Symmetry: none
Subunit: 107 residues, 2 copies
């Protein structure tokens, strides 16, 4: 999990350049994936606000068109959030499988 | 008003994973139709750009062939845009009825 991952990163301070590539990639991917999510959450807040401020003057066709953008964003945001959970699992399993070799078996 | 709009829009967005199939169909038809439109808009942008960059070297007959090809895309793009408006108005009625059931059960 997260404690083990922290202890793992904190142990590789001695050779951060020699930290596994598979992990360097998964940590960089989660950072990116979180930025995409927060950007979608923000887009959703803006789109929602904009809908609320103008809904009286929007015709049925143009309300639906605005609702597509928010739906599409709201689903892509859920898609990222779900992808983050599955990636965070794999990474914690990758770390626990690493520790079992490094520290439990002792190489 | 605005509070109610925010309320109905949340309830709506918290029900995207499970909408009536009539809506799932119509939103996917719009996703398709929108993709055709954006593809035409892009084709039009390219054809227009191409015309502008080469018009000096094009003969009158060639200039017309290029412009005629732009009219065909520009009209097909309008044809899609018009179909989207009709499909969206039909979907607003679906969205409205769904929200009414949704909120009636939640109440």
């Amino acid at each position: 999990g997260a404690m083990a991952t922290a202890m793992y990163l904190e142990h590789y301070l001695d050779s951060i350049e020699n930290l596994p590539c598979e992990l360097q990639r998964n940590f960089q991917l989660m950072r990116e994936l979180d930025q995409r999510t927060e950007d979608k959450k923000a887009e959703i807040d803006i789109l929602a606000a904009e809908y609320i401020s103008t809904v009286k003057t929007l015709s049925p066709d143009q309300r639906v068109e605005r609702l597509q953008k928010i739906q599409n964003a709201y689903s892509k945001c859920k898609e990222y959030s779900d992808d983050k959970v599955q990636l965070a699992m794999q990474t914690y399993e990758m770390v626990d499988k690493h520790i079992r070799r490094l520290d439990a078996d002792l190489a």
